[PDB]
């Protein structure tokens, strides 16, 4: 009888436990569908789309390069890509082309250092283009380097004429704007292809002809042998400005010095009028307003500047707090289970 | 030996100087230049890429070509 | 007797709950290593290899945007790179300089606004590199401009001369290519360092001096005075152009108009033929071929045309069906095996 | 009695598997949160992230495409966008604007090939900006065609001097720089608005004027009707290089060829001396060193290496032996379950 | 008939020769260049990137629009 | 003045006309353009990219210094 109802107290008790043990069996169903379906997005829609970002990120990489590649082509051989005739080369392909210094430019070509000034300054170095090849896309470039002779000895002088007076007359001395000299010897000179420079004249062709015995006696002192214009019904020039010096003539006519307010008078003696731009910065000659004076203005400056951020920074995922529960509870029972299975 | 005093008595000044030089016969040298670098890796990564800087070269280079066939 | 195989019938029942109980907690652990291999790819693997992508995309913008700075540089200041002894500069680099305008540019340099068309069509601004560092990596430019002075009054003409034909001989007349007008006054021109321009002629030296009395009255009407040439066994040039207007000397000669094809006539009493384009676009003098009218070809234009494809967008994971489905059939045995102890 | 002691025994022993199945459940707990816990680390922190990535490289690919575009202009139009008054256009632009090629340039401009050799490297043909639009990004470019009239039969030559001797004497020969023929006629030629280039002279404005009755018996062969010039006191050129051939007067001074270290002897019969760039590549003639032969220097090669890397390599997760694991033996409780039924 | 055997015993030489042409009038083309691409896209991943260019073409464009409506 | 009349009659035409401007002492100004910019992270993402910039700095930089330097 007591028996009876504890057989039947444990039929209903243990047959409760054999359904709660199928729940918690499904669910543990339930958390590996879970597990692999993270496991499917990890490895199907992250992984591929992490190596697009990265394909697609090496070749921004390689296009970058290859961009800075052609500026810095761009940067040095600019106008022979858009002239393939004939144009001036810059003075990084000149380094470049001898050895990979401009004192082996100097030694190589034999130049001077001021020779290499004149030379660029005149632009007498040349490059054509003589082969394109659009399949391995390199082009040939032909540069021309000018030989240069010096005469020793000869001096080019330039020449530069204004009127003067002599009583109330106004007169004019015509000669060459050009001349040259070696020693005591004088002739002319034909600035045609020629470039005048402080340090040397560079001529493509020659300039040297030799000039007339009446020519030589004027510039040589005898300057009543000197063609002579007289002004009448006609006009020239009045002043003349020489490295911030002014050669002017202010006879019979108003010069006045603009920054002073002074008036230029000259003396009746002199020919004439040198002013210096110390003096007189800015100068009035027959109503001309000359600037003699160089004016500074302040200094610019080209700048930029590039603010950026830092990279995002992902921390760790941190989930071992709740993974550690559960293996401590699954601990628990694990020995507790065992320990009261000694009991059966 | 020119008179630089006598001579600005009747407006001539000698307003520079410098030295001779005339050109003589040119040296010359060829320069090759390569406009597509030596790329090693070319993987499928960039494929897309090389073609493009590819396009940006026959822009500059083509009519070059046509010029200097046309022209000689 | 029937209690004691009762007794064996809940021992044999309830220790295989105890066996089926041990299969699941072991499985756990399957569940807890599964997830924490997850979370050990996560930390080890993804974030890495973000962190690498983000550092990497990072320097790519910045190398982007430094490239474009240096574009920038080679755009406005590239001449000048090439060319460090001497060039020009660009009308952005003027701009930058003076102020950021080119109101300012005007008044600071005291031009006119037709003076700044004269200075930049003769290129008359240059600029030199004076110094270079390297270690800081910049340059300093030294730029000069040039200062006008205008000689009111005075009007810079320029001569052009046929061959004209009085009977059957045909002359020629020599005149100098450049004369100059101050009011009544005539004088000689010398283009050697000008630059001739509808606004007006900037001379970088002087350019008048006086011109003879027996040239002044050639040039004043009294055309006997002038200097004629008989081109006998020589030859000159028939024909002038000048602003769309062809003036010719179609005496003893075939004249005749492509387009229409009429034969033009020359009448005896005048010297000279003047032909406009309009009348005539296309004109065969002496055999030559004369285009005088305009021709305009078809506007043409340079454009380009980018596409680009939208972002990727990863969408949400989406596991909670099963997980949410777990929840529900774990708790859900809670109170079932609690409702056990409460019979007990 | 005994089975008193059995029932106790074994409801003690289920009562510990009641609270042994409940660990497992909170264990169970811990799962979920721990498997939540990872989602929505994905959802939140690596999506957003991937997206920003994503969303990031795509403004780069533009910029770079943008930044591309712009050195493809810069590399065609530079000049133009530098100088917006008048500026030489490139052999690209040039072939864009007259169809898309140089055949059809050759066709619509009327050139012949040498005609635009000689108007490419005289510049000749010039562009100007007419038009800016800063609000939508363009400007209209207008390019000026020369037109080319060729005089049939008339040849321009350039005459270069050099002083000869008389026994002691050193005389000049007075002749203009160039001379243009027509058959048997010769005229004048000014060079001012020309390009001398051996396709032919392309000339802006007139160059032919006729020649005086006594020029023109000096060049037909009457050299006694010349004006020359006897040089005393003076000096002239005492050479003359001409593509790799000197003309030399050197008489009465002392010639040497630098290379051979030979004398070059003026022998009395002849005039002047000619000597070829292969017999002597450098002279010396009166103490000065003319280069006659032409050096040629080691070819040189511009050249770049690029070196990449593979991009990042992330595998599959690999972590379903676990997952495995666990399935099987959910599947072994799942089937022992029914087994304790039967027995109860 | 330039006779240049007695020319050249006065010192007289010929270096060159070439034929003569002289420029008639010019003709004229107009030609746009667009210096904006044409972008389809126009997301808000790009509004940056188009903003940046445009500056770009700011600093280059404008002082050309300014001199013309100052010179002109 | 001049009779453009009567020149006619001879074959001399006025092709032009301009005013005559002479030019003077010209002024002077320094710009200083400042080629690497200024950044303020650098952090060790931005080391590679910002030597490489330097590099295409001195391969234009360079040569001008150099030649500045012998030529003075
Ligand atoms: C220079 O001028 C002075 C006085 O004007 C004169 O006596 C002299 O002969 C001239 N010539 C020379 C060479 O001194
Ligand atoms: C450079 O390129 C050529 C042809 O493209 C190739 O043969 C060569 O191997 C490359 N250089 C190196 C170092 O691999
Ligand atoms: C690379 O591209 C080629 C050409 O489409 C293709 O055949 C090949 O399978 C690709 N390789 C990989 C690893 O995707
Ligand atoms: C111009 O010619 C006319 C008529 O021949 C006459 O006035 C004179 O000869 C000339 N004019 C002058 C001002 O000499
Ligand atoms: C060239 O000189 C020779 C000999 O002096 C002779 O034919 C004649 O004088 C000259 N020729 C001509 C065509 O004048
Ligand atoms: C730009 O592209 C769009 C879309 O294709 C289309 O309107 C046309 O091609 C262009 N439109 C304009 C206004 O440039
Ligand atoms: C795009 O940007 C605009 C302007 O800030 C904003 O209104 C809009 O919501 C953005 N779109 C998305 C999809 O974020
Ligand atoms: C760059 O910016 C920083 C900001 O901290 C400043 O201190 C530094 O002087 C700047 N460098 C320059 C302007 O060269
Ligand atoms: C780069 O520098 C950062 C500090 O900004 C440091 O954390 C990191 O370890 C460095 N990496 C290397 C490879 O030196």
């Known amino acids: 009888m007591l028996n009876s109802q504890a057989i039947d107290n444990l039929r209903a008790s243990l047959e409760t436990t054999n359904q709660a043990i199928e729940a918690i069996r499904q669910a543990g169903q339930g958390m590996i569908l879970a597990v692999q379906g993270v496991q499917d997005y990890i490895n199907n829609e992250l992984i591929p789309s992490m190596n697009q970002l990265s394909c697609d990120l090496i070749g921004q990489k390689l296009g970058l390069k290859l961009l800075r590649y052609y500026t810095e082509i761009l940067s040095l051989f600019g106008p022979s890509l858009r002239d393939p005739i004939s144009a001036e080369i810059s003075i990084q392909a000149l380094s470049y082309a001898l050895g990979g210094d401009i004192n082996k430019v100097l030694e190589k070509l034999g130049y001077s250092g001021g020779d290499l000034l004149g030379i660029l300054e005149s632009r007498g170095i040349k490059a054509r283009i003589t082969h394109v090849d659009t399949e391995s896309y390199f082009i040939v470039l032909s540069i021309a380097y000018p030989t240069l002779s010096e005469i020793k000895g000869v001096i080019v002088h330039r020449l530069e004429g204004v009127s003067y007076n002599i009583g109330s007359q106004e007169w004019y001395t015509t000669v060459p704007k050009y001349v040259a000299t070696q020693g005591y010897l004088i002739s002319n000179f034909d600035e045609s292809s020629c470039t005048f420079m402080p340090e040397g004249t560079v001529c493509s062709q020659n300039a040297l002809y030799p000039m007339s015995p009446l020519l030589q006696e004027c510039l040589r002192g005898s300057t009543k042998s000197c063609a002579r214009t007289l002004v009448s019904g006609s006009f020239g020039n009045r002043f003349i400005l020489s490295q911030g010096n002014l050669i002017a003539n202010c006879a019979s006519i108003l010069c006045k010095c603009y920054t002073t307010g002074t008036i230029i008078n000259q003396d009746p003696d002199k020919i004439l009028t040198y002013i210096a731009a110390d003096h007189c910065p800015v100068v009035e000659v027959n109503g001309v307003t000359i600037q003699v004076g160089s004016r500074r203005y302040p200094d610019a400056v080209y700048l930029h500047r590039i603010d950026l951020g830092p990279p995002i920074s992902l921390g760790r995922l941190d989930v071992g707090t709740n993974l550690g529960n559960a293996i401590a509870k699954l601990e628990d029972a694990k020995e507790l289970l065992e320990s009261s299975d000694q009991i059966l | ?72």
Not at chain 2, 23 to 39: A, E, G, Y
Not at chain 2, 48 to 56: K, T
């Open chain 2, 1 to 72: 030996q020119i008179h630089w005093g006598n001579l600005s008595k009747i407006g001539v000044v000698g307003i520079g100087s410098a030295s001779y030089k005339v050109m003589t016969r040119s040296s010359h040298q060829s320069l090759v230049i390569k406009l597509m670098p030596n790329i090693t890796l070319l993987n499928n990564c960039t494929r897309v890429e090389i073609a493009e800087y590819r396009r940006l070269l026959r822009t500059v280079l083509e009519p070059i070509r046509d010029a200097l066939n046309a022209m000689t």
